[PDB]
Design an enzyme around this catalytic site. Structure first.
Site, short mmCIF file in Angstrom:
data_model
loop_
_atom_site.label_atom_id
_atom_site.label_comp_id
_atom_site.label_asym_id
_atom_site.label_seq_id
_atom_site.Cartn_x
_atom_site.Cartn_y
_atom_site.Cartn_z
N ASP A 16 0.94 -1.54 -0.46
CA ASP A 16 -0.18 -0.08 -0.05
C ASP A 16 0.84 1.63 -0.15
O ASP A 16 0.67 2.58 -0.72
CB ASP A 16 -0.90 -0.05 1.29
CG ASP A 16 -1.61 -1.01 1.04
OD1 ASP A 16 -2.26 -1.76 0.36
OD2 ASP A 16 -2.23 -1.24 2.39
N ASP A 50 1.63 -2.31 4.66
CA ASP A 50 -0.04 -2.97 4.22
C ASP A 50 -0.99 -2.30 4.97
O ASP A 50 -0.35 -3.50 6.38
CB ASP A 50 0.23 -4.17 3.77
CG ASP A 50 0.38 -4.05 2.46
OD1 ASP A 50 0.21 -3.89 1.71
OD2 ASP A 50 -0.24 -5.75 1.88
N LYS A 81 -4.02 -3.92 7.15
CA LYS A 81 -5.03 -5.05 7.29
C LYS A 81 -6.63 -4.80 8.05
O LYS A 81 -5.95 -4.04 8.70
CB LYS A 81 -4.24 -6.60 7.37
CG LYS A 81 -3.24 -7.12 6.08
CD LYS A 81 -3.37 -6.92 5.02
CE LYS A 81 -2.83 -7.71 3.95
NZ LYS A 81 -3.53 -7.99 2.78
#
Lengths: 227, 240
Positions: free
Chosen positions: B73, B89, B91
DNA sequence: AAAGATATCTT
DNA sequence: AAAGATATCTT
């Protein structure tokens, strides 16, 4: 009708917090899909209510459809609405899996498939073009899209004959211009053919090479006696 | 450090704010639905500005992917030390009640970890750390639109967001998080264990080796390993 | 194209 | 559990 009305009823720039802070939008489809989905919910519920229909969303997260509309009086005349998104810089959509509720009446679906008399696709196509803002800056926040088009159409009318995805076995829609989805210029002769073709589509190329890989091939396969 | 600042920044921001809608340039606000596909989009959106504020404070430039389907990301790095990139990232997962166990899906095990350049912004070998910002929310009118004059009127579809930052290898588990999409499953545990780092792998080398050799199906994992113990034995014997 | 990658959820 | 469902995309 509920349909002409939804079609008539159909600029977002950020997410806002209960304290007034505004966070900008991202440029990807994972973001715009969610946005367009939430943008449409109030619209759908407004029009459904007008017509005496109950609106229902899925409790389990991987269930079709996004919205289920029906009058408590007629349980088998339920309507299914799914929201699909794609972008432009000819478009195509991924229309749901072909190994689920169409092959199995109750697999991953809110209500048994046979209780649904219509299956609509609301499609949004957007043309693609790190600071928080305040309520007073609404008009200076950059939007991640140049434009946005939407359409309501029957799923069977826009379905194509090629898979939309591999490992997640999705139905592919026709690959065409926006007008064609609006107008319903499909490839299938009836909803019955659409369903038969996808209920018998093989997952891989090698398994499809002995059956069919496209509409012309499927028709010749019907001729050979479905063998 | 960048890490402690970022964790404090996320933690603080999350305690003070409450996302309740999407807003139009014209002032009309649309409510949020309560499914993860939505809440995960929102949480990533809420995170971007913070991530960039902190990275800027430490000299790191921040990059997002050019294509959808490329990890991570966020790529953070210094113009002076290119080959020391940091991957982040976000989540998300939900819970039906606080305290109960959670688990996350952490990406595929057949892409960049196996092929240094598959589905990643920069060659896998240019990253020195892989971080995970995890959001856990308790699942919980919302069909009509609202105006700014009603921001604190709009109901929220979540009861109590928690966030943590931890290394991927530390929270990674030994069973797959998904089948058809070959994802790495995280440990299945309490939120505290994610914060504390109570994982299963001894090192980041173990984590990568276990995931680089994990077979795609039970049938093939019969003759290999299906869990950490079995992986260690497999290793003991000479990977035979 | 076909196949498989970024993405979580059931059961 | 594992396997395969709801998401679109890239090559």
């Amino acid at each position: 009708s509920l349909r002409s009305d939804l079609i008539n009823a159909l600029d977002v720039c950020g997410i806002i917090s209960a304290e007034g802070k505004i966070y900008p939008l991202g440029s990807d489809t994972k973001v715009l899909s969610t946005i367009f989905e939430l943008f449409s919910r109030p619209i759908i519920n407004k029009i459904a209510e007008k017509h005496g229909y109950i609106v229902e969303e899925p409790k389990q997260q991987n269930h079709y459809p996004d919205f289920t509309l029906y009058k408590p009086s007629e349980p088998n005349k339920k309507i299914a609405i799914d929201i699909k998104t794609t972008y432009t810089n000819k478009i195509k959509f991924t229309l749901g899996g072909y190994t689920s509720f169409i092959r199995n009446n109750t697999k991953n679906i809110v209500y048994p498939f046979d209780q649904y008399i219509a299956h609509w696709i609301i499609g949004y196509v957007y043309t693609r073009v790190l600071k928080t803002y305040n309520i007073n800056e609404l008009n200076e926040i950059p939007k991640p899209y140049k434009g946005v088009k939407v359409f309501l159409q029957d799923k069977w009318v826009i379905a194509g004959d090629l898979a939309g995805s591999g490992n997640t076995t999705n139905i592919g829609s026709i690959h065409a211009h926006y007008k064609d989805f609006v107008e319903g210029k499909g490839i299938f002769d009836s909803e019955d053919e659409f369903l038969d073709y996808w209920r018998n589509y093989e997952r891989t190329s090698q398994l499809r090479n002995d059956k069919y890989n496209n509409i012309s091939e499927y028709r010749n396969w019907i001729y050979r006696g479905r063998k």
